[PDB]
């Protein structure tokens, strides 16, 4: 924008205080002080999934659609958006170590999101933290908080993923919730396979 | 002397934010003509699962990024006796319970051998009356210690079913003690207006 970065690090507020606190709890995961020396961590994959489910549940919906107090877990029909291309626009990263990625490294990234006809259908901003290096495999793991608008749907995404697996072309999945738009109150997954360091093919799966 | 209404901090900023989000549910503005609400039962269960997951644990115990939901062995504590110690309730209306009513309660907690094992403090909000049935629904936030386990509980329940002696169930997570990092349910049946028999079921 007039040759400036597109990376604003601020998480947009929904002014739903329940959602804003839930997103805030995961922001605390992103911004904790991590050391390669750490021996204990939260159960990040479970935390990410539960937080996405909670964010979607915090969106008000008609009384007729809410679960009874003791009702079993039921999910709605699948909403699918596939054959989507996400392309990196700007990336901010200052490594802690000259040797390579380090635990505690922080990456900020923006992406443009396209359909197969190259129409821009959305955009996102991501905040990624290298949270650990596995003592047995040596692989690195990242936590991410993503804010996005896709086809008029406003999304938060919470991720705990393996870096080497993604770089090698593995399907990578993060937990998404929609708080505004046709998908409001739905949660599920955003998965992708990279085509290059700057482009990936992605797939959204959401359900009430 | 009176009940302390403040939610105790764990100093785990993730847990404190998660608990704070449910406190916002308790203290939201509710009205008899509300036509939409959060999906409170799902929110309560998800928030309990998140609180337990936010407890740090040894690296070897954390789930892989795409691992299926696997739960640990059940921890069960049953035939617990919970007795009201203090209660604070000022009705908005002389005509009976109202949407927006607030109840504060403390209890002492005993095992089936009548040994004292802990205590709790609860904050309860009446959030809706159903037009068809006239039944009232409440949201609750409970902080407790139960034989050395520090718990939060998140409830969305029907009032009349509890008053009728039906089993009532809320969602619980343990953030400190032997059960740390586990979540599940606290359910109970009332024996009077001041005593209940409860059951704790938790899993990692």
Residue A80 to residue A176: CA distance in whole angstroms: 13
How big is chain B by its Cα radius of gyration, in Å? 17
Count how many residues are written for chain A: 208
* Distance (Å, whole) CA B8 – CA B152: 10
Give the closest of B39, B47, B169 to A61, CB-based: B39
Q: Which residue in A146, A169, A173 sits closest to A161, CA to CA? A: A173
Question: What is the rounded distance in angstroms from the CA atom of residue B48 to the CA atom of residue B52?
Answer: 6
Residue-by-residue DSSP string for B101-131: -EEEEEEEEE-TT--EEEEEEEEEEEEEE-T
Tell me which H or E stretch contains A5: none
Tokens 């770089």: give the residue: A167
Are A205 and A187 a contacting pair, CB within 8 Å? no
Report the structure determination method: X-ray
| Closest in A40, A46, A62 to B35, CB measured | A62
Q: Let me know how many helices (H) and strands (E) chain A has, helices first.
A: 3, 10
**Cα separation of B83 and B107, whole Å?**
5
Structure tokens at A133: 């290096």
Q: Do A161 and B65 touch (CB under 8 A)?
A: yes
DSSP code string of A20-64: HHHHHHHHHHHTS---TT--EE--HHHHHHHHHHHHHHHS-EEGG
Residue in A closest to B26 by C-alpha = A18
Residue with tokens 């449910």: B22
Selected residues 67-126 of chain B with any CB under 8 Å from a CB in chain A: 67, 69
Vertex A101 angle, CA A132 and A161, to 5°: 45
- Residue whose token pair is 């969106």: A59
- d(CA B138, nearest CA chain A) in Å: 10
Phi, psi dihedrals of residue A145, rounded to the nearest 5°: -125, 120
Q: Does A31 touch chain B (CB under 8 A)?
A: no
CA angle A80, A43, A131 (to 5 degrees): 90
Q: Is B134 left (phi over 0), alpha (psi -120 to 50) or beta?
A: left
Q: Do A185 and B64 count as a contact with CB atoms less than 8 A apart?
A: no
Q: Which helix (H) or strand (E) holds B170?
A: strand B168-176
SS3 B78: strand
Contacts of B148 (CB under 8 A, 6+ apart): B118, B177, B178
CB of A66 less than 8 A from some CB of B: yes
CB-neighbour burial class of residue A133 (10 A; exposed 0-12, middle 13-18, buried 19+): middle
For an interface test with B, the pick among A58, A134, A135, A208 (most B C-beta atoms closer than 10 Å) comes out as A58
Q: Which helix (H) or strand (E) holds B135?
A: none
Q: Which residues contact B2 (CB under 8 A, 6 or more apart)?
A: B86, B88
- Between B38, B69, B169, which is nearest A60 by CB? B38
Q: A59: nearest CA in chain B? A: B38
When CB atoms are compared, the residue of B20, B45, B64 closest to A21 is B20
Closest alpha carbon to A69 in B165, B191, B160, B151: B160
Tokens standing for residue B22: 């449910």
| Of residues A29, A39, A63, nearest to B37 (C-beta) | A63
Q: Rounded to an integer, what is the distance from CA A5 to the centroid of its chain?
A: 20
A34: closest CA of chain B, how far (Å): 12
The answer to whether the Cβ–Cβ distance between A63 and B35 falls below 8 Å is yes
Of the candidates A177, A186, A198, A192, which has an alpha carbon nearest to the alpha carbon of residue A23?
Answer: A177
Work out the minimum CA distance from B165 to partner chain A, whole angstroms.
Answer: 15
Contact flag A25-B39 (C-beta cutoff 8 Å): no
**Distance from chain centroid for Cα B137:** 14
Nearest chain A residue to B21, by CA: A18
- Kindly list the residues from chain B whose CB atom is less than 8 angstroms away from the CB atom of residue A160: 65
How many whole angstroms separate alpha carbon A86 and alpha carbon A16? 28
**CB-CB under 8 Å, B13 with A65:** no
Residue B148 sits at the chain A interface (C-beta within 8 Å): no
């Amino acid at each position: 924008s007039h040759m400036t970065t597109s990376i604003d690090p601020t998480t947009p507020l929904t002014y739903n205080p329940v959602i804003d606190a839930l997103v805030g709890s995961w922001r605390q995961i992103i911004d904790a002080d991590y050391s390669a020396d750490d021996t204990r961590l939260p159960d990040l994959a479970v935390l990410a999934r539960s937080t996405a489910r909670a964010v979607a549940a915090a969106v008000p919906r008609p009384l007729a659609e809410i679960s009874a107090p003791d009702a079993p877990d039921e999910r709605g029909e699948l909403v699918l958006l596939e054959k989507v291309i996400q392309e990196v626009a700007d990336r901010e990263y200052t490594p802690l170590s000259p040797e390579g990625p380090s635990v505690g490294d922080l990456v900020l990234v923006t992406e443009k999101i396209y359909n197969s006809d190259r129409e821009e259908i959305g955009a996102d901003t991501g905040r990624l933290r290298i949270i650990r290096k596995d003592p047995e495999t040596g692989h690195h793991f990242t936590v991410s908080l993503v804010t996005s608008t896709v086809q008029g749907n406003k999304l938060f995404a919470f991720g705990y993923t393996e870096m080497e697996a993604q770089l090698a072309g593995g399907r990578t999945t993060i937990q998404v919730a929609c708080w505004d738009g046709p998908w409001a109150g739905m949660s599920g997954t955003l998965s992708w396979v990279i085509n290059s360091m700057t482009a990936a093919e992605s797939r959204y799966e959401l359900r009430r």
